[model samples]
Target: DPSLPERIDTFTELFNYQLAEKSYDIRVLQSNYPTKLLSPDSMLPQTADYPLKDIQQLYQLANTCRGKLPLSPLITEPLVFTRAICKGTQLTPRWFSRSGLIHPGGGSYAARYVDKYPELQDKLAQYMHIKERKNVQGDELLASLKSMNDDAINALIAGASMFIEQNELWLRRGDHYFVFPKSVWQENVANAGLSFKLASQTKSCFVKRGNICWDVE
Candidate 1:
């Protein structure tokens, strides 16, 4: 949006001045791969020690700090809520692992946590030192999802959501896999023995909002 600041320095200045005292930032989104994952701005180092704005910079930073600094400054992988990251007490990677659309078993990339933490019964415990229930909620969700039909899964993704995966079509509303670009509801109102109402208009264009075209016209 035009109202939002577009550059990193501007955002950081605002953050340090107005938002720093309250311990709050105004926005966030799904940190998943498909939608609103790692933006160029988000990946930039927030401190003087490291400043990477693009993939090349990220690679360079990684190399520059290889033996110098083993750990980078804590970069908040933005959450689906404005205050969600700041408010959470138990800081760990697993804390933000919820709301994933797909879950694979055995040796898939997503399932690496399990093998990594074979002793803990779940991979989340392997990656982050957090004690979750033995009957892990994620496991149950996976089991339930495995039993559902694709249509049912798709339906689950479309309904009300706390998070969205713009890039990855998969999402979850409750117990099923869902993909978005959903139809919005409007009361069906008609005159003279009929009733109908408007629904959310379907979007057709592939271009995103305010997407600038730089080619010569």
Candidate 2:
């Protein structure tokens, strides 16, 4: 079957109108957003390649930067969007029987890592309890799906968890999907109104605090 073409002109007109004549001088992040990535003193990554030991060193460095940055005062556009609707910008509201992606980004990746490194499996499972089900659902779904069979329940959990992980379920706002350094991760998670548990882990892995606190007493 052939697909029918719709009005391309209308779409173009809408885009042009929305973007045109809009003067944006918004200084959201400091000019150092890039420089931070460059500066040795900055928390942002200076180079893409990092050795295993470099990670812990980096966390200490970031904690130093966090004290100096005082990022709580800085409000991003996405935060503004959610704040616009809600009086206080709390994360997102908890819901039951939600429908969506398990790890909007690469939840499967988390599952795989845990499976490959069995040590993480139990910890991951405990964190995803009812208390932090929404957050755990996303992380666990990512870890579980990649490790175990893709059963109907697992698949559904992954989809729903991802939706929550990457988006504001109530307001329909999602952040980027890729896992990144703590600096970027904080910003991304903050946008979604969430926080991480580990301050530092292996180069490519991070867990939301809920995942950690779940295992703790």
Candidate 3:
């Protein structure tokens, strides 16, 4: 028994180490994407934005932007992929609406699309109308923007897909590989609203091993 060292802290330390490594992977994917499309680097004027790092931030931005900009398929498809990363597989319009700016019972966000692809959509519909019907300069700029938007979304989903699978596996195990009981544990629990039927031996609840569901003595 002497060879069995006295603690399981090593297990907890190992689990935390894995999470730190995965978190770094997630951050790398987030920062590595094209910064110019959204944020401080965005070329578009009056665009309020932040770096697209994770699903929650992605949702927050999309929701805020609802009805604010025309939904181009080039831009909208990547958003669907990002949501799949959060949910672990596939995208649904209902899921999109529930999580996006539109709430439950709100009309379908997908239905609002007149422009399946930004390039195919009438540019002048939103673009300021210049009297010249043949402005090659405007055409080139629009074409370039659409291309950039496609690339940005592709990078996002590529990163998110890897991160989602790794994260789900990590979470399935447990909160941690080991748990430690703190000093003054009973007092902490009492203050936190757990009432003991009997004060004597009530402290047994605090001394459980890692796998305990409940410790009632």
Name the top lDDT candidate. Answer: 3
Arrange candidates by lDDT, descending. 3, 1, 2
Better of 1 and 3 by lDDT: 3
lDDT string for model 1 (56-158, tens) is 3433433353322233333222212112323433433554355331111111122333433354344343222111123355554333333433333333333
Root-mean-square deviation of every model? 17.7, 22.6, 20.4
Candidate 3 residue-wise lDDT, 1-217, digit = tens: 2111122222223333343322223343234323322222222221233223333444554455332223544445445543444444543444433333221112222322212333423432222111112235546432322433333333333332111121121111232211113332334333333322221324553422221212222
Best by TM-score: 1
Question: 1 or 2: which has the higher TM-score?
Answer: 1
For model 3, what is the C-alpha lDDT against the true structure? Answer: 0.30
User: Over all chains combined, what TM-score does candidate 2 have?
Assistant: 0.16
After superposition, the stretches of candidate 1 with alpha carbons farther than 4 Å from their true spots are 1-110, 123-143, 160-217
- In model 2, where do residues sit more than 4 Å from their true spots? 1-9, 15-47, 57-217
Worst 10 residues of 2 by lDDT: 95-104
